[PDB]
Design a protein around this ligand. Structure first.
Ligand SMILES: [Cl-]
Ligand SMILES: [Cl-]
Ligand SMILES: [Cl-]
Lengths: 266, 266
């Protein structure tokens, strides 16, 4: 086949928040997705181990054949983007810089909040990236350890999801923050709950749309856009159970006949 | 050492793209070259425009630029690919970004393109749009009077309202939900165009997405400046420095700028 996939890697279902926007903006492009569900959560892992896992996921998709790689996971971007971009010859991007661009576009008062895992918050990748674009922006980050489990368990629409968001995000209401970055790719699955809680004064940013535009931009830049009418065969891979992944994926994506497969990494 | 982002244009229109780069990339210095002595470019030879475009590029490269934006739609159709190949810096135009931005904004995949007679005759927008999404419907409409309404300053007033209603009337009979301002002068008319078309239509200032791609490309190459301290913008024209300054200092909110007159070609 002539169609080459864009690859996406993530600790689980998070990266689907980028995939949705790629399906929208780049409808002719084939998606190969890998969620490392079995070693989720990545949040509390050290930088070295996260990078090692990101490489295992990368090597898996490079072997299947990809023309580009999106590290659709914040802690993986922080841990390993530069090394992976360096060593591969295909385009590689992450999700931190696009979310930073999106947030700085949405803010009115330059007070930005960031929600993330422990690994991401401790990396300081968000404040560094944001102040590297605009050194006068204020950036405060809030770790939300429970969000990933709630999303992976498929409880993200439920009453318990409403409660854990209310508990975790309460501190933000003490500040004047007007923009909140969803700095874990899983969190947009909680976005309706986060928006209701924070109200109309706070723009809640899903980094997926800006990431998908950058994918489009780079493909267009290097003449890598697919120009074929070959039938699109999206492939999804998980290190965990396929049915749970399908149930979440089919809810987030409008895709009833999705092909999901279980694989091994190590 | 601090290097500028280069912009080349036939005139003042491209300053609307510079404006968004000032917002999104406040640490970066800009070098802008407007060839006012030889505009409009639209009804000129396709080959001759490439020569002019090359002359402007060479001028800015001699002055140390780390990125080139070709803000002129005729310039980008006539010599973007050639300029990338020869230079060792990133070069982009405003057409692909506008198209990318329209595909994000559209909900029913029916898009209108506004521009000069020359732009809409070139099909640059439809070409780019259908390269990304082949199912998108595109209607193209020349708006000859808009460039003068803008340069003359009549956009600030009620007289501009009538001109917009007259020119864009055909579009109300379509189901278009997105309109691309496919001339860099047209953003000064955006509020008037939004009021006329109404809440159901997204109006696209292609300068915004262009500025984001500039930010993304600089970041890919680790060429984003962290600091703001030593910024020294340069603005160059082959025509009247005073006429240009008078426009530019309003649009860019930069009362103390200087505009340098230059000589290009024969
Ligand atoms: Cl993460
Ligand atoms: Cl965590
Ligand atoms: Cl133009």
């Amino acid at each position: 086949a002539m169609k080459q996939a864009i690859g996406f890697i993530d600790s689980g279902v998070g990266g689907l928040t980028v995939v949705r926007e790629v399906l929208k903006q780049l409808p002719h492009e084939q998606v190969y997705y890998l969620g490392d569900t079995a070693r989720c959560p990545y949040g509390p892992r050290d930088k070295e181990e996260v990078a090692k896992f990101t490489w295992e996921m990368t090597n898996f998709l490079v072997d299947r054949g990809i023309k580009m790689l999106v590290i659709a996971c914040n802690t993986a971007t922080a841990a390993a983007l530069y090394d992976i971009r360096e060593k591969l010859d295909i385009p590689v991007i992450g999700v931190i810089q696009p979310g930073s661009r999106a947030a700085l576009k949405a803010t009115r008062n330059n007070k930005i909040g960031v929600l993330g895992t422990l690994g991401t918050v401790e990396s300081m990748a968000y404040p560094t990236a944001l102040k590297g674009l605009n050194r006068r922006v204020e950036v405060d980050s809030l770790a939300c350890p429970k969000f990933v489990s709630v999303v992976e368990s498929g409880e993200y629409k439920s009453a318990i999801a409403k409660k854990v968001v209310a508990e975790s995000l309460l501190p933000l209401k003490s500040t004047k923050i007007d923009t909140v970055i969803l700095g874990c790719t899983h969190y947009p699955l909680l976005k309706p709950i986060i928006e209701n809680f924070m109200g109309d004064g706070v723009a809640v940013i899903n980094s997926g749309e800006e990431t998908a535009s950058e994918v489009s931009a780079l493909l267009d830049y290097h003449n890598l856009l697919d120009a074929t009418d070959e039938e699109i065969e999206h492939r999804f891979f998980t290190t965990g159970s396929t049915q749970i992944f399908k149930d979440i994926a089919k809810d987030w994506l409008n895709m009833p006949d999705m092909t999901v497969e279980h694989i091994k990494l190590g």
